[PDB]
């Protein structure tokens, strides 16, 4: 037979305490904190002032990363490591201070509007110091890219070093490598199509398999497109195993072959190697 | 390609709005309200002063139902229809008032401690009135059961009627039915085992299938266990189609047969029916 | 090192599959089904037509239980076992049919408005049959209470029996028990306060501890409040071991003692017991 | 600027700690415990052996309440207060023991299959004792209803009393009340329709508004439907303020008026009240 | 006493509306949107076509970032700012159009398979225009890295500028800084280990603390590893405070010291400073 | 009328299975996996050993990206593509092996502490091979930046190429573009403020609108700040359409105008264009 148990009543005072509500609230907040962290590291932070960076014009993850636009008053306090800044010194130079760092910490600056100049510079103070710099780093190169990295921290020593580069320009090299001079005693090395550059600068170093013979030379070449030729000026020639003070070890000539500015390297010595590298170029663009 | 959608954040500003939290609290309290209503209708209400009728000595559902034990002060205000009361007038009479009812409404009382008396009565006032009673119903019968029922409501016409009966006592009837007087002209009707009662009272009405002959009589019988016999006293005899004022219509005798006090009904008239009903009994018990 | 695991996304394709959503709907409906079953068994079913038995005038649990008030059309189909009915035959007699039952099944009826009569009867048909009744049970007693109980089911043998009693009336017994006739040869048995009844009927059976002497008598008594006395009429006297046909075995007298109608039982025979039982009373009330 | 907060991760190490999971399991079981307690108090407990009282033939709430059918072995241990039992002693008598009770506690029994007899009795032992009974209560009345109630508990004083009555039978009273004898000196009191009963027994007590004149009588009446008359037998007549030992105080006659067996009460004494109460009836039914 | 409240029922129509289900679904989708945004910015987008970038070969976050491979038809519509592209012009030149930008917006291109050439170029049209370019930017440098940045937006003026660099090559500088010429009038500056380069180009500028004396010269040096010597060729010499047209101001010599090609700078003038920077180098590698 | 449904009970065995608990646990873990992936790609991985990269000093998203510091034993197994490394060869050279890659895959190395040298080099083995390299790539340039990119995969061929650059240094170019020589036959081109550099190297190429006349020359200039002048040395002059071997085609002069080192280019020929590019500079800093 059924022997009932006394009356039981649902404790309405236990509809909380680590139950959904508590977990979803604590979870969501954590999730939001993390995403805000990520989005603000790769997106425009100025959007946070609107729906917390949401909406049709809200924050997005830039695969290229993002450089923040901050105000003067905001730079009154040390910047955190890992941040990126797009500096604007249009109305006045700005100073940025970087908090003490640890080995590998980095901070990068960009100058999209090209406001950086000698009168309105970008002054950087990296907590403690910057190597090779007395005091603050003063940047006056417009449209520049400055990267600061901490090269020593341990404890009481926080030292940084920096790099400064142009954001824009044609810096590419059309050719760099090493080629063998075939048994025929000559090798053609295509440098670039006749229409890519008007002028190029290259370094050529030829050495025998045993290093007894070697020559190096710097060459500036001019592309004469109208006559389909290439003028050259070889200088700073240096040789080591030259049998005669007239013995070249290796001759370098230029011309256009198959519409490609081409370097022709030949040598008497057998088993000669030749390193060719284009370290500069100039292309006449459009004025302005 | 994949065109991302701007940043989306979790609206923690919601969550607790008519959700698992609200439906369990609005649901729980609802489940605790109903059950409480059921357990207090079929259980001791006095226990509500503890763990709200819970615990080891908590409230339970009495299949027999339950009769609440209230205090004088509590009965100071009209009682709700459908309630049950176990009255205690040991210290003083108690007055109970019943709220206006509607057809069928019911309130029942009992007196387990038998305190009801003429000095400590149970006074009942049924809003408006009680039929056959001018004013309040005054109950003075100890160990009684009082049932009040609304026999009329409509508008103001809220009238009640009542019944009062003993909670205890031997009230059973060992036999009641109708038997045919067999063609042989005689029928034996066992009433009860010889040890069940010392005396019984019965009503016997014999009638012909046509209805022209009929006799009724009231008989008191005494069980003589020692001599295995039964004395009888037949009176208030009434006959209708009796062809003569002599022996007539049907004879009723008693004796013990197979250890059962038995009634033997015989008649000359063919096709006679005999209704026998025991309406009272007395059994000698143990003094006190 | 930390070797990440590929991207993982939340399978929203799930969530609503047998979870908090499904268990609350499959649970709630279950809780509303049961309670409804309980409140409609102990409350007015007519209220279901409102807020499903809710609200201020909603359904409540009647400790006294409840007797449903249905319509003619509703009784057109067999009623379920265990139900209660408050019959209304004021406009016309009503026929109620009870579905086949099993041993113990029960259906109860009452007649609060007292409409039951011979012209507007309560006809009851218990699937299969009712003992001692050929066909339907025809109830014509106004303000009655009818109880039907299945006394046999097995296979088709589904038979019922019934009881019919008055809802109202004074049915209590002011005294019933057994008393010893003290060695002094006399015993006083208080029956009731002088103001409780005008007349009473009692059964008295005196028997010796051995069982050789025994007497029973039926006595009607009238309370004469004005003269503080009690008239009595003793009849249907029966004796067994009476040594003589003269005064014998036990005498029964009445009077008022301490304001209580009292029975005084005396006997010459030592070691006599006396069972006294009041089987009827009449109290003059207020006309109408 | 936006200064992010370090990475935050979701503490899955929690979740299932007193949350939706725990409150539904601790709540559900609670809801299933209570309902089970209610359905088993008002429904067949034998069904618990199936789908825990569920399914098509599951447990239901009986408005009439329910009386459990247990086995001998189950009754080997004391029963809880408030329970109901449908006894079966067809194969052998059964002994039921009731745990110690407190004032008002109740246990009820019925005998639907009418197996109770002197050879296969229902023996009841109420922890401590039953008033007027030395030892166990031995019930031998078939088709009876036994009610046990604790009339005293306190400390060890845990005493019970009981009532026993027939489950079936016609026990109703067709009339009970008080009527004024109109100034005309006569009053008609309709008792019942001529077809309702063959014989009735009534008590009649007439008393003057002052109380100096009073008469009571017991009358048995026989309905002669064929001749549309009613025979009566008035006896045990008792009078108090009767100015003469001749015809006196009030006369009682019977007849059929408007098809209703009717009592006509008349008296010379002005200002007389008449209480009439039918205490027994007999109706010839169908044999067997 | 307990005064129950009417029946209450759990509203099953409130198992939704901002409850778990709604929040978890809306939350998860947002979370997924964000992660897809991040992963697609730093991972292969071509994987989205498979299990939405999940699985054992699903998307991962590249610390180095990622450059997407898109098809010709996909470039038919403007590319979003912040995206990265790995161009493939193997079967035909491809044109990319960049949506209008805002100050700082950036888009970067890479050419991993070296397909870029004059016949199958990378044509870029940056909505509105590119500074120093008439119309589209036509890139013909294979294995190149092109970066476009918006240098002016405001409103109706969206101007971009670009940088083009080689993805590969030895561009490092083995030494750059400023050294003091000790009072001894000479300073050794280690340039690089004898085995790192065969040829180097440096710029040397010496200036007195007061800037009255200063000399600048460009020097190409050849490392003769066999004889453990270094040949040099100094030219473009310029001086300002030279006392005589024979006075050098500062002499620069080279040799191998401690196995490091070393610059030895000496001067008569006291307090002379010397800036040394290696602006080019050549190392003979392996042919092909 | 209400026709109840059998008992229903809440299945406590369904408080799980894809319900909150399961989804929140599976979701959270996925979320954590993703964020750990992101944070470890842009943050210090050494922090994972502490509270899983959480806390006040927990991991953060570096907008500049991050280069991991791993131990020798960790480099015993192939590095995944997309990773970044800050190499430390202070106590011994380290070897890194890169897993097979696919077109575009990249791995980048940095040397923040400048430990890289010939005795403690950075040896890199890119599964399969590196173009122009026999076997492993041996890096001996301190404070270097090495980038490896896969330029060919398909199937059985996984070839990589690399770039090596200095992490630090002044590499910026103060001017690069093309200017028209006005009809006046002369044009001034500001190069940089007098205080920015002591020496600069530029390439100048002038060509007529029809390309019949053209001249190219390399020029080193020295800024004499004390006398506010600029000394120049023009060489490697090459011309094509020169009418006479004395006809210059274009003359280039230098001076300080408005405090800016300035190039003045003039020519007889009408419609002459002039490309000016500064390919190197030297600024005397502070010794040490």
From Swiss-Prot, chains A, B, C, D, E, F:
The gene is 9. Peripheral baseplate protein that is part of the tail fiber network. Connects the long tail fibers to the baseplate and, after virus attachment to a host cell, probably changes its conformation to trigger the signal for tail contraction. Involved in the tail assembly. Keywords: Coiled coil, Viral baseplate protein, Viral release from host cell, Viral tail assembly, Viral tail protein, Virion. It comes from the Viruses. The lineage of its organism: Viruses, Duplodnaviria, Heunggongvirae, Uroviricota, Caudoviricetes. This is Baseplate protein gp9. Induction: Expressed in the late phase of the viral replicative cycle. The C-terminus is bound to the baseplate, and the N-terminus coiled-coil domain is associated with the long tail fibers. One of its GO terms (biological process) is viral release from host cell. Homotrimer. The gp9 trimer interacts with the long tail fiber (LTF) that comprises gp34 trimer, gp35, gp36 and a gp37 trimer. Part of the baseplate macromolecular complex which consists of gp5, gp5.4, gp27 (central spike complex); gp6, gp25, gp53 (inner baseplate); gp7, gp8 (intermediate baseplate); gp9, gp10, gp11, gp12 (peripheral); gp48 and gp54 (proximal region of the tail tube). InterPro entries: Baseplate_gp9_C, Baseplate_struct_prot_Gp9/10_N, Gp9-like_sf, Gp9/Gp10_mid_dom_sf, Gp9_C_dom_sf. Residues 20-80 form a coiled coil. Its main location: virion. One of its GO terms (cellular component) is virus tail, baseplate. Transmembrane segments: none annotated. It is found in: Virion.
